[PDB]
Amino acid sequence: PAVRISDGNLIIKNRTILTGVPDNVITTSASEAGPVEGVFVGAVFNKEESKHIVPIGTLRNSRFMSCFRFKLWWMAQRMGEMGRDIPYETQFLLVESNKVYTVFLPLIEGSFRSCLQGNVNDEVELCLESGDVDTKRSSFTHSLYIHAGTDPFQTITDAIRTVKLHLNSFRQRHEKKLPGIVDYFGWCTWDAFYQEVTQEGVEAGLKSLAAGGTPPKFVIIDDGWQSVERDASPIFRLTGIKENEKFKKKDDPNVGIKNIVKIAKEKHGLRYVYVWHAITGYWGGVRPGEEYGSVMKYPNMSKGVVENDPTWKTDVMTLQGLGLVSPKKVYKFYNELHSYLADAGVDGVKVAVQCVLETLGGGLGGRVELTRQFHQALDSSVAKNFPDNGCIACMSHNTDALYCSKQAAVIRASDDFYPRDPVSHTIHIASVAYNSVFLGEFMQPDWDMFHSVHPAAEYHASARAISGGPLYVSDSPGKHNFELLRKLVLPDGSILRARLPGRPTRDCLFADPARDGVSLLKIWNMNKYTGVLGVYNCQGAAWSSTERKNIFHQTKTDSLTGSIRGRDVHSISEASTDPTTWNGDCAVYSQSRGELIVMPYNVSLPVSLKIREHEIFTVSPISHLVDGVSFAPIGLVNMYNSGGAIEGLRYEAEKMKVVMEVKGCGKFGSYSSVKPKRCVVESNEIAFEYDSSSGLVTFELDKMPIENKRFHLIQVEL
């Protein structure tokens, strides 16, 4: 059978994972397709309730990684070995058996949402909640799915796919359409002006970035553009769907947000303009009234949320309530808002405050149903009005929204970049990476804005470059480091985006790089013909289970030594042009030191980093043309994700030749065991340098491709 409950134990491929599984916990592997390689898990209770806790069994001596909600809106990571260390509001749990990896996916079932939590006796408890005292139930069959496998990343993907086939309520990341913003540099107004943003400020930011040679091609007009008012520190509520006076042209107040849109696009060459709104309209919802059936609703506290984030009990939203648009009118609300924006030339929305819905289901069939209804309406309106799929999900890390993510393709992966909070930087990097392990199954992770002028700029920028996600700053106008931005952004505003969600390496999945005082975090991604690896020291700070907020904590050393290997890039074989004959040797380029090293298969290279330092490595499979003639493309060596520039690669061993298609401009690098005879770009021989000690070949790609002609055609004759 393979995953099974026997005697009182949960057994996975002949390893006991849980003991003391109680008799009322039921399993099934049946499906309409049919037998499934894991087990759905439920339980039967005596009483109908709107909340149940049930132990699934006892976990001891098994290393785990968990993603848990430290705030309502947002997850972070926790590792451990005992059930007692499993946080409240655990939404994703991965367990290592010492070789076999087991995923636990607590699910939505009917009107109920589940999560996991640990107890003092080391039990892993399943917590099932409808979010509404009127919505009650006494038995469940599919509230948790458990699946095991030998590759931890494949195990997670396979488990998600099985849940999808049972629920049919979401699609996997790879089945969705990415909006076109993810291929361009952008700018977000949020940290530049906060809610004091004006149309002149938007224009000044677009102009200042473009002037330094790194032109953004998308803009997010963040919180502050909307027409909002306090009731007749008081909460603001939405009072109409159009923009406020700061976005009406001063000249003609009848021309609204279309003015800044046309300025952005026609005068400054932007492609996309997005705006922020809350899933409820504004922070205080929408002012009560009959037009969208808005009525006052006050957040209901759930125990697990409040145990981890006690300030939510006295948040302005909790105490002052939200005007909640009616489910009967929610499509009308989004569709009138979004029709107005789209008719003004707006291409998408950043939709924030998403998880509040789970607290507002009391009148209305509970957390799952209300979430599903608002998302169904949001998705219809987005698909109508922003048909490039222009939606970024924000403050949305609840399983109620994840398991109905049928269309939206970009998700903010962590709590906000905080330019003024020194504790936040190392935390942010760990959180984006670990959360991306689970969130990247549903949507492309967005690792958030950052500042190009800031002590942690390079640390943040480097992580964005390897994230696979949208790349955007929130710089105040005129506060730019263009030397840093040139490592991210080409002269036409395009970026070198990697192909996958950036995630921790296999090595790092079970070792906490914020708390263990011993390990570096390694983040891997893939391009088409190289891998990429980012190494970070993020020790010294993390969410505290006793203070219930992010704090600094003590470290034994400042500096830590770890190591890298080619195969740390988990999917590196996929970059090889001949994976069946490849021996696993890679060329490894350090983009900060500018050093090229050949690393044989399995050979480790030491890396030492102090807290808040990082290093980026481009990792390229070596091709052996003939004895003594070996090559690997590196890419745009003065960019962080250098290998993202290589769009085609063919070896012609019979002519001793390499044929490449390369996007961008700047210095191009490659590994060759021999000095090339000639390097040719677009039919003309060009000069080049060769370091015979390292094998590094280097030449300049002078300008971006002429036309249109999207790539430089390069021939390296060995």
Ligand X SMILES: OC[C@H]1O[C@H](OC[C@H]2O[C@H](OC[C@H]3O[C@H](O[C@]4(CO)O[C@H](CO)[C@@H](O)[C@@H]4O)[C@H](O)[C@@H](O)[C@@H]3O)[C@H](O)[C@@H](O)[C@H]2O)[C@H](O)[C@@H](O)[C@H]1O
Q: Which residues bind to ligand X, rule: CB under 6 A? A: 71, 73-74, 190, 222-223, 276, 352, 394-395, 415-416
Closest to ligand X by CB, 454 or 565: 454
Minimum distance, C-beta of residue 451 to ligand X, in the bound complex (Å): 13
Tell me if residue 105 falls in helix, strand or coil: strand
| Nearest one of 610, 614, 612, 615 to 557, comparing CA atoms | 610
Rg (CA), the chain: 26
Upper half-sphere CA count for residue 300 (Cβ side, 13 Å): 16
Minimum distance, C-beta of residue 271 to ligand X, in the bound complex (Å): 21
Token readout for 231 is 């009731």
Token readout for 5 is 């409950």
Minimum distance, C-beta of residue 493 to ligand X, in the bound complex (Å): 21
Closest to ligand X by CB, 447 or 631: 447
Minimum distance, C-beta of residue 353 to ligand X, in the bound complex (Å): 7
Closest to ligand X by CB, 190 or 617: 190
Task: State the DSSP code for 266.
Answer: I
Provide the residue count of the chain. 718
Query: How far apart, in whole angstroms, are the C-alpha atoms of residue 548 and residue 87?
Result: 11
Minimum distance, C-beta of residue 394 to ligand X, in the bound complex (Å): 5
Task: State the DSSP code for 286.
Answer: B
| Nearest one of 496, 479, 478 to 487, comparing CA atoms | 496
Closest to ligand X by CB, 144 or 286: 286
Minimum distance, C-beta of residue 188 to ligand X, in the bound complex (Å): 7
Residue nearest to ligand X (CB): 223
Query: How far apart, in whole angstroms, are the C-alpha atoms of residue 591 and residue 635?
Result: 11
Closest to ligand X by CB, 195 or 380: 195
Minimum distance, C-beta of residue 324 to ligand X, in the bound complex (Å): 19
Minimum distance, C-beta of residue 278 to ligand X, in the bound complex (Å): 8
Which helix (H) or strand (E) element contains residue 616?
A: strand 614-621
Closest to ligand X by CB, 223 or 507: 223
Closest to ligand X by CB, 52 or 71: 71
Query: How far apart, in whole angstroms, are the C-alpha atoms of residue 505 and residue 557?
Result: 23
Which helix (H) or strand (E) element contains residue 375?
A: helix 366-385
Closest to ligand X by CB, 248 or 277: 277
Query: How far apart, in whole angstroms, are the C-alpha atoms of residue 614 and residue 619?
Result: 16
Token readout for 586 is 């890679």
Query: How far apart, in whole angstroms, are the C-alpha atoms of residue 371 and residue 702?
Result: 51
Closest to ligand X by CB, 124 or 392: 392
Closest to ligand X by CB, 309 or 379: 309
Minimum distance, C-beta of residue 448 to ligand X, in the bound complex (Å): 7
Do 440 and 503 contact (CB within 8 A), yes or no? yes
Closest to ligand X by CB, 102 or 318: 318
Do 649 and 635 contact (CB within 8 A), yes or no? no
Task: State the DSSP code for 267.
Answer: I
Minimum distance, C-beta of residue 283 to ligand X, in the bound complex (Å): 7
Residues with Cβ within 8 Å of 83's Cβ and at least 6 positions away in sequence, in order, are 58, 59, 60, 118, 119, 121, 122, 123, 124
Query: How far apart, in whole angstroms, are the C-alpha atoms of residue 537 and residue 560?
Result: 8
Task: State the DSSP code for 223.
Answer: T
Closest to ligand X by CB, 338 or 663: 338
Minimum distance, C-beta of residue 309 to ligand X, in the bound complex (Å): 9
- Integer distance in angstroms from the first to the last C-alpha of the chain? 56
Tell me if residue 91 falls in helix, strand or coil: strand
Any alpha helices (H) in 37-100, and if so which ranges?
none
Do 269 and 215 contact (CB within 8 A), yes or no? yes
Look at the alpha carbons of 285, 298, 439, 163 in this order and tell me if their dihedral is positive or negative: negative
How does DSSP assign 396-410, residue by residue? Answer: ---HHHHTT-SS--E
Residues with Cβ within 8 Å of 234's Cβ and at least 6 positions away in sequence, in order, are 320
Minimum distance, C-beta of residue 222 to ligand X, in the bound complex (Å): 5
Minimum distance, C-beta of residue 447 to ligand X, in the bound complex (Å): 12
Closest to ligand X by CB, 420 or 556: 420
Minimum distance, C-beta of residue 390 to ligand X, in the bound complex (Å): 16
Query: How far apart, in whole angstroms, are the C-alpha atoms of residue 408 and residue 484?
Result: 31
E strand segments, 189-231:
218-221, 226-230
| Nearest one of 233, 229, 205 to 219, comparing CA atoms | 205
Closest to ligand X by CB, 190 or 331: 190
Closest to ligand X by CB, 190 or 340: 190
388 exposed, middle or buried (CB, 10 Å; 0-12, 13-18, 19+)?
middle
Query: How far apart, in whole angstroms, are the C-alpha atoms of residue 12 and residue 27?
Result: 13
Closest to ligand X by CB, 71 or 570: 71
Upper half-sphere CA count for residue 9 (Cβ side, 13 Å): 11
Minimum distance, C-beta of residue 233 to ligand X, in the bound complex (Å): 7
Minimum distance, C-beta of residue 115 to ligand X, in the bound complex (Å): 19
